[PDB]
Amino acid sequence: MELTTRTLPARKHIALVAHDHCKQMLMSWVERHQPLLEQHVLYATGTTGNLISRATGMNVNAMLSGPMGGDQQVGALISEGKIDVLIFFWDPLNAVPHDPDVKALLRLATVWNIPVATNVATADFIIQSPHFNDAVDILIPDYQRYLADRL
Amino acid sequence: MELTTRTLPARKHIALVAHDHCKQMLMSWVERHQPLLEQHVLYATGTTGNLISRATGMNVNAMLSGPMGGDQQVGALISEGKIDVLIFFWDPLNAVPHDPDVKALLRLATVWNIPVATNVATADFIIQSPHFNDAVDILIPDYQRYLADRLK
Amino acid sequence: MELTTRTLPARKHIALVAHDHCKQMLMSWVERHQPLLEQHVLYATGTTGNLISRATGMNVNAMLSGPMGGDQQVGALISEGKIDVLIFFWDPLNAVPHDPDVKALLRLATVWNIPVATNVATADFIIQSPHFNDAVDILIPDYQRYLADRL
Amino acid sequence: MELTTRTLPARKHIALVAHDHCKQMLMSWVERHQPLLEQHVLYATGTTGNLISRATGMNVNAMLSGPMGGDQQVGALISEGKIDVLIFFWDPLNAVPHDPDVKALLRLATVWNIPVATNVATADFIIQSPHFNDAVDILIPDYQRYLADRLK
Amino acid sequence: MELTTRTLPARKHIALVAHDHCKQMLMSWVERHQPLLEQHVLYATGTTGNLISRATGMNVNAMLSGPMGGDQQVGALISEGKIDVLIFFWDPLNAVPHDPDVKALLRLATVWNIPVATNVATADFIIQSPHFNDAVDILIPDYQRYLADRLK
Amino acid sequence: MELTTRTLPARKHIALVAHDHCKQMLMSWVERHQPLLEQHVLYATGTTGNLISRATGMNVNAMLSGPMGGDQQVGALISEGKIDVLIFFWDPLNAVPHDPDVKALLRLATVWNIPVATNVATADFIIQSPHFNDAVDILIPDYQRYLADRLK
């Protein structure tokens, strides 16, 4: 497929999503790195976002709750190049009704080549990377060329 | 779960999506009903939308191709109350890589209670219904009450 | 895929299926439209069918409960051309153990091109449509030609 | 889950289903055991059934092709107690569009407790087992009691 | 796809796995056949294995609980040719979080052509088969040839 | 669910897995990072591992091909604490027959809390992270306590 590049801004647009049983996990993680996270732009699904801002006083752009469409709203933003990092703590030990939304979101984050963390270890490694606050060139599919081929 | 209502406008915002093997079907359907479709607002995923406007001269707000995120863009619009009708001709005889996106979109259309057609027969029945060109009231989940309960 | 046609009779054979959390929703819908439904032939999965007839006094051909095979019984009828309309209020906010049966049923209804409603809004639009009470042709795959090709 | 019993007849009603890439395998298996299979009642999905009878001259009750509804027809028969054994050689190395039908069929065969073989080794072990040719009692869910509980 | 053969030893390596709602049924099944099972090598996922040995005093090589990776441990053993029979009583009436692990395990058991039982009826037919205690040859994919083709 | 900790060694055990259409991407990534990868222990699925060592001369512990059980072998290793990092470039634009194995592997990597990369951007961020060469303490589920609760 045709690939091109896009530049992740120094100031990243970060999406924070967590399933109910993983919310405390994300909360702690966020509080632990608040000083650094405050330097970026935060987005979150409904419940997650509200809990975060209510607890840290940080400004979070909250979307709809995941089951109500929040996951697809985030997915859409990712495909539009408006989200640069996804921290998605999904529950691997509980079945969720919106499982297709979960898999769809992770599929898009993989397609659009943005840094994704699905557990604390990966989140820590990503946020501690030296270039987390630098602009970095990532390869992304060349949509214009892709569409032109379909037509 | 508390329910509330929303009014579908007389002029509907229609999303048109079709998997490759079902594109000719959708095309024909759109052309045969062009006179009526011209009175509403059309949205479509990347390839579908371009094929439609290129063939009917109708104005279609094209989003990204489905596999690249178009299905989730439509889903987001539905959940935001910006899409009133979904005509999704998905292929039931072929496995698609973005199957989760397909299922997720149909799940949201079901949750938000908007008219959905996944085959020609259903599409025809919906577009021929008397209140298709009228303002119709639909029951929808009361999100505010729903969220307020989660943050209790 | 060569297509052929089949005629949906004026008096439709309607299958009514509802997941547990969506049962009250279907009940109300059925009661509100009883005068019209009274004019057609009703089929339903085990629990759903019994609740309907017990509440409306309408005659419903009940099949097995969905989890026990009812969804596949309905699917089989659809493929045999014995079901003309499917009203399936499945729960989009709860994971069901027989999810494959659910998806398989919706897949067949799509393949055989019969009117399908998965929510109240769609159900209302379909039942209020002019040809709901008329005999009307629908295009369907030409099975004979399809099988002949596989051999 | 109240349980009851049902008796599998000596002459079994056998469903034979195979995905395209596994058809030659089923054919060989059927031919190898034709003498024994000829004593029972055979059912199959559309293509599989026709290939078998055309090759062995055996009488097979063919249903619709799997993708067109054949798997659900077999599933329905199983739940109605009309199928006693299922030989389903599904392809574990290829994605099929009707995957939900495949999983649904296997789920029903598991629920109704009938012998099921998804590969040759299991098929051979089953067909060589004593009770394959005798009548035997199996436990099955007590549906009447199950339904009575749902309407209480 | 090239096939070759492997010989299941007379003394089989049996994997016993059961979802919570199906544990009592597996327990009864095991106790009911203890005399025979005592002649073979038993493996099981964490909880299942501990319950069995604690109740029958039989020696069971317990792996991790299924949700924590046990199903994949068993799957790995099967692909390595270290498991000859799989008795997997999965719950067809309850959704499990590790559903992909379940399907993956059954997919591998199908690919590697080993006897598999997902319900009591199939388990009984397999364990009563004459050759359950004999060395028996099964057709398995020829991996060496398969890999050589991918690296050609 | 109680938690405990485990220490990822300075010298990491890295699993490298790539679907066919993503193999060239992984190859390039490995070559550009060879100097660093050379200091750790590499594992890979069948085809991937062989292509890597054949091209870089690096020593890779190759397991079975993914469709033949390789993904479950890796998953088993992860659950046993023998894999510390997973670089899995799965294809999001193509349907794979062993999709359940794919999802199962990613589910286990999530459960056991090890660094996981599913695309180049994430892989780059992880390998450039300060502690990639240091011993790091990760929180993992306390299995002993977890099992003890199931056996209560």
mmCIF file of N, CA and C in Angstrom, chain B residues 25-123:
data_model
loop_
_atom_site.group_PDB
_atom_site.id
_atom_site.type_symbol
_atom_site.label_atom_id
_atom_site.label_comp_id
_atom_site.label_asym_id
_atom_site.label_seq_id
_atom_site.Cartn_x
_atom_site.Cartn_y
_atom_site.Cartn_z
ATOM 1 N N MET B 25 -25.486 -2.843 -6.285
ATOM 2 C CA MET B 25 -26.827 -2.909 -5.730
ATOM 3 C C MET B 25 -27.221 -1.537 -5.206
ATOM 4 N N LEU B 26 -26.368 -0.953 -4.374
ATOM 5 C CA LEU B 26 -26.662 0.355 -3.805
ATOM 6 C C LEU B 26 -26.798 1.422 -4.885
ATOM 7 N N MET B 27 -25.917 1.374 -5.880
ATOM 8 C CA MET B 27 -25.940 2.335 -6.978
ATOM 9 C C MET B 27 -27.303 2.339 -7.642
ATOM 10 N N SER B 28 -27.740 1.153 -8.058
ATOM 11 C CA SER B 28 -29.032 1.000 -8.715
ATOM 12 C C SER B 28 -30.142 1.520 -7.833
ATOM 13 N N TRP B 29 -30.091 1.160 -6.556
ATOM 14 C CA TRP B 29 -31.110 1.599 -5.622
ATOM 15 C C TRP B 29 -31.145 3.120 -5.527
ATOM 16 N N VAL B 30 -29.971 3.737 -5.479
ATOM 17 C CA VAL B 30 -29.895 5.184 -5.371
ATOM 18 C C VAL B 30 -30.454 5.852 -6.625
ATOM 19 N N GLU B 31 -30.071 5.342 -7.783
ATOM 20 C CA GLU B 31 -30.549 5.899 -9.033
ATOM 21 C C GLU B 31 -32.070 5.816 -9.196
ATOM 22 N N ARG B 32 -32.660 4.676 -8.845
ATOM 23 C CA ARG B 32 -34.102 4.498 -8.969
ATOM 24 C C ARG B 32 -34.876 5.396 -8.022
ATOM 25 N N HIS B 33 -34.230 5.832 -6.949
ATOM 26 C CA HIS B 33 -34.895 6.699 -5.981
ATOM 27 C C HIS B 33 -34.275 8.093 -5.926
ATOM 28 N N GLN B 34 -33.477 8.415 -6.934
ATOM 29 C CA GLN B 34 -32.820 9.713 -6.984
ATOM 30 C C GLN B 34 -33.755 10.894 -6.720
ATOM 31 N N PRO B 35 -34.911 10.942 -7.402
ATOM 32 C CA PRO B 35 -35.848 12.049 -7.191
ATOM 33 C C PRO B 35 -36.147 12.303 -5.724
ATOM 34 N N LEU B 36 -36.304 11.230 -4.961
ATOM 35 C CA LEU B 36 -36.610 11.360 -3.543
ATOM 36 C C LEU B 36 -35.363 11.654 -2.714
ATOM 37 N N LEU B 37 -34.267 10.976 -3.030
ATOM 38 C CA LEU B 37 -33.029 11.171 -2.287
ATOM 39 C C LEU B 37 -32.495 12.590 -2.432
ATOM 40 N N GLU B 38 -32.728 13.188 -3.593
ATOM 41 C CA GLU B 38 -32.286 14.548 -3.844
ATOM 42 C C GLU B 38 -32.863 15.551 -2.835
ATOM 43 N N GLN B 39 -33.956 15.195 -2.177
ATOM 44 C CA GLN B 39 -34.566 16.102 -1.213
ATOM 45 C C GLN B 39 -33.985 15.986 0.186
ATOM 46 N N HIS B 40 -33.011 15.102 0.365
ATOM 47 C CA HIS B 40 -32.409 14.950 1.682
ATOM 48 C C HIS B 40 -30.908 15.183 1.639
ATOM 49 N N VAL B 41 -30.260 15.089 2.796
ATOM 50 C CA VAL B 41 -28.815 15.287 2.885
ATOM 51 C C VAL B 41 -28.086 13.945 2.914
ATOM 52 N N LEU B 42 -27.224 13.719 1.930
ATOM 53 C CA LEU B 42 -26.490 12.469 1.828
ATOM 54 C C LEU B 42 -25.051 12.467 2.328
ATOM 55 N N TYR B 43 -24.698 11.391 3.020
ATOM 56 C CA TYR B 43 -23.359 11.175 3.543
ATOM 57 C C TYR B 43 -22.996 9.767 3.102
ATOM 58 N N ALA B 44 -21.714 9.501 2.923
ATOM 59 C CA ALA B 44 -21.301 8.175 2.514
ATOM 60 C C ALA B 44 -19.842 7.967 2.879
ATOM 61 N N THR B 45 -19.402 6.718 2.844
ATOM 62 C CA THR B 45 -18.020 6.428 3.139
ATOM 63 C C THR B 45 -17.287 6.783 1.851
ATOM 64 N N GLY B 46 -15.965 6.907 1.941
ATOM 65 C CA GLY B 46 -15.139 7.280 0.803
ATOM 66 C C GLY B 46 -15.446 6.817 -0.612
ATOM 67 N N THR B 47 -15.238 5.539 -0.891
ATOM 68 C CA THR B 47 -15.468 5.040 -2.233
ATOM 69 C C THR B 47 -16.929 5.113 -2.649
ATOM 70 N N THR B 48 -17.813 4.640 -1.780
ATOM 71 C CA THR B 48 -19.246 4.655 -2.058
ATOM 72 C C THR B 48 -19.722 6.064 -2.442
ATOM 73 N N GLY B 49 -19.424 7.037 -1.583
ATOM 74 C CA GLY B 49 -19.833 8.409 -1.827
ATOM 75 C C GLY B 49 -19.370 8.976 -3.155
ATOM 76 N N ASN B 50 -18.115 8.725 -3.503
ATOM 77 C CA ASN B 50 -17.570 9.236 -4.750
ATOM 78 C C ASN B 50 -18.215 8.589 -5.963
ATOM 79 N N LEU B 51 -18.490 7.294 -5.868
ATOM 80 C CA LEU B 51 -19.114 6.594 -6.977
ATOM 81 C C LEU B 51 -20.518 7.131 -7.196
ATOM 82 N N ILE B 52 -21.223 7.387 -6.100
ATOM 83 C CA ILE B 52 -22.587 7.883 -6.192
ATOM 84 C C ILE B 52 -22.656 9.245 -6.863
ATOM 85 N N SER B 53 -21.942 10.223 -6.313
ATOM 86 C CA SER B 53 -21.962 11.572 -6.880
ATOM 87 C C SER B 53 -21.451 11.594 -8.318
ATOM 88 N N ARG B 54 -20.436 10.790 -8.609
ATOM 89 C CA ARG B 54 -19.894 10.735 -9.958
ATOM 90 C C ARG B 54 -20.916 10.172 -10.944
ATOM 91 N N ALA B 55 -21.815 9.327 -10.456
ATOM 92 C CA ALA B 55 -22.817 8.703 -11.312
ATOM 93 C C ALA B 55 -24.170 9.406 -11.348
ATOM 94 N N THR B 56 -24.558 10.044 -10.253
ATOM 95 C CA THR B 56 -25.852 10.711 -10.205
ATOM 96 C C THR B 56 -25.756 12.230 -10.207
ATOM 97 N N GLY B 57 -24.556 12.746 -9.984
ATOM 98 C CA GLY B 57 -24.396 14.186 -9.953
ATOM 99 C C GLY B 57 -24.960 14.754 -8.664
ATOM 100 N N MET B 58 -25.405 13.877 -7.772
ATOM 101 C CA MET B 58 -25.956 14.313 -6.497
ATOM 102 C C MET B 58 -24.811 14.734 -5.590
ATOM 103 N N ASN B 59 -25.107 15.592 -4.626
ATOM 104 C CA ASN B 59 -24.079 16.050 -3.704
ATOM 105 C C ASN B 59 -23.980 15.120 -2.493
ATOM 106 N N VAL B 60 -22.825 14.482 -2.320
ATOM 107 C CA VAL B 60 -22.625 13.562 -1.200
ATOM 108 C C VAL B 60 -21.438 13.939 -0.318
ATOM 109 N N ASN B 61 -21.684 14.070 0.981
ATOM 110 C CA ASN B 61 -20.618 14.386 1.922
ATOM 111 C C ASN B 61 -19.841 13.093 2.168
ATOM 112 N N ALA B 62 -18.728 12.924 1.463
ATOM 113 C CA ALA B 62 -17.924 11.717 1.592
ATOM 114 C C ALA B 62 -16.963 11.737 2.772
ATOM 115 N N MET B 63 -16.927 10.632 3.511
ATOM 116 C CA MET B 63 -16.030 10.489 4.645
ATOM 117 C C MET B 63 -14.910 9.584 4.174
ATOM 118 N N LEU B 64 -14.125 9.071 5.113
ATOM 119 C CA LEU B 64 -13.028 8.185 4.764
ATOM 120 C C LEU B 64 -13.567 6.833 4.327
ATOM 121 N N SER B 65 -12.733 6.068 3.634
ATOM 122 C CA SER B 65 -13.098 4.728 3.198
ATOM 123 C C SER B 65 -13.352 3.951 4.484
ATOM 124 N N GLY B 66 -14.228 2.955 4.425
ATOM 125 C CA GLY B 66 -14.551 2.183 5.617
ATOM 126 C C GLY B 66 -13.369 1.593 6.362
ATOM 127 N N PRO B 67 -12.501 0.856 5.668
ATOM 128 C CA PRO B 67 -11.328 0.248 6.305
ATOM 129 C C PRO B 67 -10.373 1.246 6.934
ATOM 130 N N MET B 68 -10.397 2.492 6.458
ATOM 131 C CA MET B 68 -9.497 3.522 6.975
ATOM 132 C C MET B 68 -10.103 4.347 8.089
ATOM 133 N N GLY B 69 -11.332 4.015 8.477
ATOM 134 C CA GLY B 69 -11.981 4.736 9.558
ATOM 135 C C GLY B 69 -13.341 5.322 9.245
ATOM 136 N N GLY B 70 -13.775 5.200 7.995
ATOM 137 C CA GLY B 70 -15.063 5.751 7.598
ATOM 138 C C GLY B 70 -16.269 5.232 8.366
ATOM 139 N N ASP B 71 -16.256 3.946 8.719
ATOM 140 C CA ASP B 71 -17.371 3.356 9.457
ATOM 141 C C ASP B 71 -17.473 3.971 10.839
ATOM 142 N N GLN B 72 -16.333 4.258 11.460
ATOM 143 C CA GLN B 72 -16.353 4.857 12.791
ATOM 144 C C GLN B 72 -16.740 6.341 12.739
ATOM 145 N N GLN B 73 -16.461 6.983 11.609
ATOM 146 C CA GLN B 73 -16.830 8.385 11.436
ATOM 147 C C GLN B 73 -18.361 8.440 11.380
ATOM 148 N N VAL B 74 -18.952 7.536 10.602
ATOM 149 C CA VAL B 74 -20.410 7.462 10.497
ATOM 150 C C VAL B 74 -20.991 7.118 11.866
ATOM 151 N N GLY B 75 -20.374 6.159 12.547
ATOM 152 C CA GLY B 75 -20.854 5.780 13.860
ATOM 153 C C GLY B 75 -20.839 6.953 14.817
ATOM 154 N N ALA B 76 -19.772 7.744 14.771
ATOM 155 C CA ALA B 76 -19.666 8.904 15.654
ATOM 156 C C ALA B 76 -20.797 9.897 15.362
ATOM 157 N N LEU B 77 -21.053 10.132 14.077
ATOM 158 C CA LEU B 77 -22.115 11.042 13.662
ATOM 159 C C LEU B 77 -23.464 10.554 14.167
ATOM 160 N N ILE B 78 -23.698 9.245 14.073
ATOM 161 C CA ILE B 78 -24.958 8.672 14.539
ATOM 162 C C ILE B 78 -25.138 8.927 16.028
ATOM 163 N N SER B 79 -24.092 8.672 16.799
ATOM 164 C CA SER B 79 -24.177 8.859 18.238
ATOM 165 C C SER B 79 -24.320 10.326 18.627
ATOM 166 N N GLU B 80 -23.918 11.223 17.736
ATOM 167 C CA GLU B 80 -24.019 12.649 18.019
ATOM 168 C C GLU B 80 -25.337 13.198 17.515
ATOM 169 N N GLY B 81 -26.166 12.323 16.955
ATOM 170 C CA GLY B 81 -27.465 12.741 16.453
ATOM 171 C C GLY B 81 -27.431 13.475 15.127
ATOM 172 N N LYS B 82 -26.367 13.278 14.357
ATOM 173 C CA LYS B 82 -26.221 13.951 13.079
ATOM 174 C C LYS B 82 -26.588 13.104 11.876
ATOM 175 N N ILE B 83 -26.879 11.829 12.104
ATOM 176 C CA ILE B 83 -27.294 10.950 11.014
ATOM 177 C C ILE B 83 -28.658 10.408 11.437
ATOM 178 N N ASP B 84 -29.630 10.439 10.528
ATOM 179 C CA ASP B 84 -30.981 9.989 10.864
ATOM 180 C C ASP B 84 -31.382 8.654 10.266
ATOM 181 N N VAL B 85 -30.705 8.264 9.198
ATOM 182 C CA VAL B 85 -31.009 7.017 8.516
ATOM 183 C C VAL B 85 -29.728 6.398 8.007
ATOM 184 N N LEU B 86 -29.605 5.085 8.162
ATOM 185 C CA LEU B 86 -28.415 4.391 7.703
ATOM 186 C C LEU B 86 -28.799 3.290 6.733
ATOM 187 N N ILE B 87 -28.242 3.339 5.529
ATOM 188 C CA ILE B 87 -28.480 2.323 4.518
ATOM 189 C C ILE B 87 -27.109 1.690 4.418
ATOM 190 N N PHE B 88 -26.945 0.519 5.029
ATOM 191 C CA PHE B 88 -25.667 -0.178 5.051
ATOM 192 C C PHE B 88 -25.752 -1.538 4.378
ATOM 193 N N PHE B 89 -25.360 -1.613 3.111
ATOM 194 C CA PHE B 89 -25.391 -2.876 2.386
ATOM 195 C C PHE B 89 -24.069 -3.598 2.598
ATOM 196 N N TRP B 90 -23.965 -4.322 3.705
ATOM 197 C CA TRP B 90 -22.748 -5.057 3.987
ATOM 198 C C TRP B 90 -22.835 -6.424 3.320
ATOM 199 N N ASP B 91 -21.679 -6.977 2.969
ATOM 200 C CA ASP B 91 -21.594 -8.267 2.287
ATOM 201 C C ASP B 91 -21.677 -9.465 3.234
ATOM 202 N N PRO B 92 -22.794 -10.206 3.199
ATOM 203 C CA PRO B 92 -22.945 -11.365 4.080
ATOM 204 C C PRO B 92 -22.298 -12.633 3.535
ATOM 205 N N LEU B 93 -21.644 -12.530 2.383
ATOM 206 C CA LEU B 93 -21.018 -13.699 1.783
ATOM 207 C C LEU B 93 -19.525 -13.530 1.560
ATOM 208 N N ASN B 94 -18.920 -12.605 2.290
ATOM 209 C CA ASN B 94 -17.489 -12.359 2.168
ATOM 210 C C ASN B 94 -16.953 -11.826 3.483
ATOM 211 N N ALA B 95 -15.789 -12.319 3.899
ATOM 212 C CA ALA B 95 -15.181 -11.878 5.150
ATOM 213 C C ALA B 95 -14.411 -10.592 4.907
ATOM 214 N N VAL B 96 -14.683 -9.564 5.708
ATOM 215 C CA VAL B 96 -13.973 -8.294 5.563
ATOM 216 C C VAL B 96 -13.026 -8.094 6.739
ATOM 217 N N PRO B 97 -11.832 -7.538 6.481
ATOM 218 C CA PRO B 97 -10.850 -7.301 7.545
ATOM 219 C C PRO B 97 -11.353 -6.361 8.643
ATOM 220 N N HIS B 98 -12.194 -5.395 8.277
ATOM 221 C CA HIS B 98 -12.721 -4.462 9.263
ATOM 222 C C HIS B 98 -14.091 -4.887 9.797
ATOM 223 N N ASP B 99 -14.269 -6.191 9.982
ATOM 224 C CA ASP B 99 -15.520 -6.729 10.504
ATOM 225 C C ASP B 99 -15.901 -6.103 11.846
ATOM 226 N N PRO B 100 -14.927 -5.891 12.747
ATOM 227 C CA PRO B 100 -15.335 -5.281 14.017
ATOM 228 C C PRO B 100 -15.965 -3.903 13.808
ATOM 229 N N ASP B 101 -15.446 -3.152 12.841
ATOM 230 C CA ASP B 101 -15.974 -1.820 12.547
ATOM 231 C C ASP B 101 -17.416 -1.959 12.069
ATOM 232 N N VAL B 102 -17.657 -2.958 11.220
ATOM 233 C CA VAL B 102 -18.988 -3.224 10.676
ATOM 234 C C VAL B 102 -19.982 -3.514 11.806
ATOM 235 N N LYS B 103 -19.617 -4.444 12.681
ATOM 236 C CA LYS B 103 -20.468 -4.809 13.794
ATOM 237 C C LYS B 103 -20.669 -3.663 14.761
ATOM 238 N N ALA B 104 -19.623 -2.863 14.964
ATOM 239 C CA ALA B 104 -19.698 -1.724 15.877
ATOM 240 C C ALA B 104 -20.663 -0.670 15.348
ATOM 241 N N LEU B 105 -20.629 -0.431 14.045
ATOM 242 C CA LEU B 105 -21.518 0.552 13.432
ATOM 243 C C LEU B 105 -22.984 0.116 13.556
ATOM 244 N N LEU B 106 -23.262 -1.152 13.270
ATOM 245 C CA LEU B 106 -24.629 -1.652 13.368
ATOM 246 C C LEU B 106 -25.082 -1.648 14.821
ATOM 247 N N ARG B 107 -24.142 -1.842 15.741
ATOM 248 C CA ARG B 107 -24.491 -1.847 17.156
ATOM 249 C C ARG B 107 -24.936 -0.455 17.598
ATOM 250 N N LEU B 108 -24.237 0.565 17.114
ATOM 251 C CA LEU B 108 -24.561 1.938 17.488
ATOM 252 C C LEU B 108 -25.877 2.390 16.881
ATOM 253 N N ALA B 109 -26.129 1.992 15.638
ATOM 254 C CA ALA B 109 -27.372 2.347 14.956
ATOM 255 C C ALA B 109 -28.555 1.734 15.705
ATOM 256 N N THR B 110 -28.322 0.572 16.312
ATOM 257 C CA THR B 110 -29.358 -0.106 17.069
ATOM 258 C C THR B 110 -29.572 0.633 18.384
ATOM 259 N N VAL B 111 -28.479 0.968 19.058
ATOM 260 C CA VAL B 111 -28.545 1.681 20.328
ATOM 261 C C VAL B 111 -29.243 3.037 20.211
ATOM 262 N N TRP B 112 -28.915 3.794 19.163
ATOM 263 C CA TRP B 112 -29.491 5.121 18.979
ATOM 264 C C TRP B 112 -30.834 5.159 18.265
ATOM 265 N N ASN B 113 -31.393 3.976 18.031
ATOM 266 C CA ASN B 113 -32.720 3.822 17.446
ATOM 267 C C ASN B 113 -33.044 4.599 16.181
ATOM 268 N N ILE B 114 -32.200 4.498 15.166
ATOM 269 C CA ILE B 114 -32.492 5.187 13.922
ATOM 270 C C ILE B 114 -32.817 4.131 12.878
ATOM 271 N N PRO B 115 -33.626 4.489 11.877
ATOM 272 C CA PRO B 115 -33.965 3.515 10.838
ATOM 273 C C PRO B 115 -32.703 3.000 10.149
ATOM 274 N N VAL B 116 -32.572 1.679 10.062
ATOM 275 C CA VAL B 116 -31.412 1.050 9.434
ATOM 276 C C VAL B 116 -31.844 -0.001 8.429
ATOM 277 N N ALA B 117 -31.239 0.011 7.248
ATOM 278 C CA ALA B 117 -31.547 -0.969 6.223
ATOM 279 C C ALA B 117 -30.247 -1.663 5.825
ATOM 280 N N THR B 118 -30.231 -2.996 5.859
ATOM 281 C CA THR B 118 -29.035 -3.751 5.496
ATOM 282 C C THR B 118 -29.214 -4.539 4.212
ATOM 283 N N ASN B 119 -30.381 -4.399 3.598
ATOM 284 C CA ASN B 119 -30.650 -5.046 2.326
ATOM 285 C C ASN B 119 -31.666 -4.190 1.557
ATOM 286 N N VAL B 120 -31.810 -4.454 0.264
ATOM 287 C CA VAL B 120 -32.711 -3.688 -0.581
ATOM 288 C C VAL B 120 -34.164 -3.699 -0.134
ATOM 289 N N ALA B 121 -34.668 -4.867 0.246
ATOM 290 C CA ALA B 121 -36.054 -4.968 0.679
ATOM 291 C C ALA B 121 -36.333 -4.032 1.837
ATOM 292 N N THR B 122 -35.443 -3.999 2.825
ATOM 293 C CA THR B 122 -35.665 -3.126 3.970
ATOM 294 C C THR B 122 -35.543 -1.657 3.568
ATOM 295 N N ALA B 123 -34.607 -1.374 2.664
ATOM 296 C CA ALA B 123 -34.372 -0.014 2.197
ATOM 297 C C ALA B 123 -35.624 0.476 1.508
#
